[PDB]
Design a protein around this ligand. Structure first.
Ligand SMILES: *[C@@H]1O[C@H](CO)[C@@H](O)[C@H](O)[C@H]1NC(C)=O
Ligand SMILES: *[C@@H]1O[C@H](CO)[C@@H](O)[C@H](O)[C@H]1NC(C)=O
Ligand SMILES: *[C@@H]1O[C@H](CO)[C@@H](O)[C@H](O)[C@H]1NC(C)=O
Ligand SMILES: [Ca+2]
Ligand SMILES: [Ca+2]
Ligand code: NA
Ligand code: NA
Lengths: 365, 57, 368
């Protein structure tokens, strides 16, 4: 076992080429005589953090050596004004890893139409599935300007088409745009008239946090071509949680930033060459941004669209001009989200709720 | 003391006053410093001889 | 399981075995073998073939027979072999069971009594010192009789029989003059006090060259604060279960005995302790598993002294507490020159008025 007090980094190492495997982890206070500090901070001996195991598994597991700084940079504060510590129980096992689910499918070669569920009452809205939790649950949020405040949950695909909901969540704030996403039983959304991302745990039905996306344009300032307060778009891929937005520093161009789903902080920022208002929507795969350029209802002397014309890699920090044909049967493309578990796109296009199939390249480099 | 052979003397004459001047140079290698295991840093001093006495630098 | 651990200069290294397993060093080097491993200035790279043999000895004394280890790869734990070169620590270690040996490195106990054991011969000199190397498993005897302003040679004897018969193996010509009887041999190297200085000189017997010179801070030297008999015995060196020690006196402690642990590799003070006993009032002193034993005795010139030949003071380093004892000490002759303890044989290597003698020890379990 390993133990380290607040702001003190912890070290984990297995002999030879053996891999670290976390069994039990807690960030808080269970015992008062282990660490040494002020007695006022030691009065509360009942501090707990369940997400501690999830954080350690994402960094230490399937690796020979590990170094995690036990502070606010890696762990969110559960109880304020209390000197915390990190208790970790780990075992040394062979260097074997689990394939397909976490692993990158490659570079996108072509998008094709897959499923057509139904034609919703709203022109614009957003639908998705939680890729972390192994469940057939569908999350639905039809966008209504200055009135979006509810997230609908469906038990299965059959219930979603038939319109049989399981439960409806009453959100603490109004939602702006069709950019919402669900990451490990928690809802991430853009709060109305703010550059803030709100974390809402579906299990507890309470808000867990609110993060400020620095210099980000909000409330119809820099949305997608259709507007509708699409200023901030959230994405989920193989690399983790992402924030697709725009800053005035980049002159309205798309700015992509990786967000930590627990600490709710920016873990890197990238500036692109593509203008957000010129873009119809965007999605992340393996840390690569894909810009959708589509045609819309009411387009004076216009036919140019229905394509992926720009790509931006985060690891390489380099951009390229592509021409991947994108399906647009109905003109008003509202939302495009990628699910790494099924490798399909979750699209909302002019009242229509559609799923798109993907084809990938033999290599990614 | 450093051995006589290591010393390279120069017999010079000054402009300001007509008197015998002496200039001596001694080479110090890396091998001399790295192999010296004394308590202080490798130091050197200069001793000059006259008809009246001596002086340290 | 076999492992590899690497860390550049001034960067501490960490070693840990799973569960309750113990660390075991096989190969260790502090210097430079490869240039592309560490990242620094290119001038230090592709130019130096730097090696340190003592690296294994240092790691075995700290990491071995322990679950976790943290050694700062710098001048505090490792002496600099090549200056102006960015060094690193390469260690190969294996995880083995925790069970360790008993009474080898371990303290035999508190001194209960001192008795006469062996009488070798009667030397030509009244004062001097003799000892063996407790680290190296050999019957070699190191002899050095004291001659004022003339001591500069150490004599080596093959065995006990040759030492009595006066048949020497080899004589070492020292680079400096030695002051007082205070000297010892620690792992094939000689530690002594250089004349008219508060400095300890390290001299490797194998290579026959000086490896280092350490300054014992504020220490009184050259007949300033010696033992009762005097004879420039201002600085005394001791070897025990805890390691290498320096018995001396400072003017800060007002002539009283000051004991400091010295590292045999880096040649630095790893702790200082101040006692209540005056050095000039004492005859000699010795260290046994971190405990100082101060010997009070009568001399030939002393006109019927109330000072009997007994150990009357003790000082513990771990507890930092002192006590007044009364252990009987052998008084056959009157001029006690040097008293040194050897942890391998648990005997006293004494020089008493021309006579070279060995004393047997009785140990009590008074430790806890
Ligand atoms: C990594 O470790 C986690 C912890 O159990 C495991 O679930 C996962 O399959 C391992 N492999 C990868 C690629 O994450
Ligand atoms: C030694 O010093 C002299 C000058 O006194 C110099 O000319 C000579 O080159 C030096 N030796 C070497 C190897 O440089
Ligand atoms: C300590 O570890 C060394 C390394 O093998 C071993 O030889 C020794 O017996 C152990 N115990 C002691 C007291 O040194
Ligand atoms: Ca999107
Ligand atoms: Ca002694
Ligand atoms: Na979205
Ligand atoms: Na001695």
């Amino acid at each position: 076992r390993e133990l380290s007090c607040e702001s003190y980094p912890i070290e984990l190492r297995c002999p030879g080429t053996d891999v670290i495997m976390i069994e039990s982890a807690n960030y808080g206070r269970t015992d008062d005589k282990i660490c040494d500090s002020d007695p006022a901070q030691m009065e509360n001996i009942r501090c707990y953090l369940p997400d501690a195991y999830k954080i350690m598994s994402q960094r230490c597991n399937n690796r020979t050596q590990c170094a995690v700084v036990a502070g606010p940079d890696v762990f969110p504060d559960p109880c304020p004004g209390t000197y915390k510590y990190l208790e970790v129980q780990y075992e040394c096992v062979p260097y074997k890893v689990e394939q397909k689910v976490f692993l990158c499918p490659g570079l996108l070669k072509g998008v094709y139409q897959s499923e057509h569920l139904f034609e919703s009452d709203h022109q614009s809205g957003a639908w998705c599935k939680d890729p972390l939790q192994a469940s057939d649950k569908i999350y639905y949020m039809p966008w209504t300007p200055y009135r979006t405040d509810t997230l609908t949950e469906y038990s299965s695909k059959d219930d979603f088409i038939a319109g049989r909901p399981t439960t409806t969540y009453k959100l603490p704030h109004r939602v702006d745009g069709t950019g919402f996403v669900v990451y490990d039983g928690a809802l991430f959304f853009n709060k109305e008239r703010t550059r803030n991302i709100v974390k809402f745990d579906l299990r507890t039905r309470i808000k867990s946090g609110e993060a400020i996306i620095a210099n980000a344009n909000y409330h119809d300032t820099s949305p997608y071509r259709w507007g509708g307060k699409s200023d901030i778009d959230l994405a989920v891929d193989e690399n983790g949680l992402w924030v697709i937005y725009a800053t005035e520093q980049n002159n309205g161009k798309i700015v992509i930033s990786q967000l930590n789903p627990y600490t709710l902080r920016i873990e890197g920022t990238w500036d692109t060459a593509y203008d957000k208002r010129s873009a119809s929507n965007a999605f992340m795969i393996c840390g690569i941004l894909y810009v959708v350029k589509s045609v819309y209802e009411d387009d004076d002397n216009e036919a140019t669209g229905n394509k992926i014309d720009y790509i931006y890699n985060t690891d390489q920090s380099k951009d390229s001009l592509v021409d991947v044909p994108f399906p647009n049967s109905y003109q008003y493309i509202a939302a495009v989200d990628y699910n790494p578990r099924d490798n399909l796109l979750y699209v909302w296009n002019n009242y229509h709720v559609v799923k798109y199939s993907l084809d990938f390249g033999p290599l990614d480099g | 003391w450093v051995h006589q052979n290591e010393h390279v003397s120069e017999e010079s004459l000054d402009e300001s006053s007509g008197l015998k001047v002496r200039e001596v140079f001694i080479n110090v290698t890396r091998q001399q410093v790295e192999d010296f295991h004394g308590p202080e840093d490798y130091w050197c001093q200069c001793v000059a001889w006259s008809h009246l006495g001596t002086s340290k630098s």
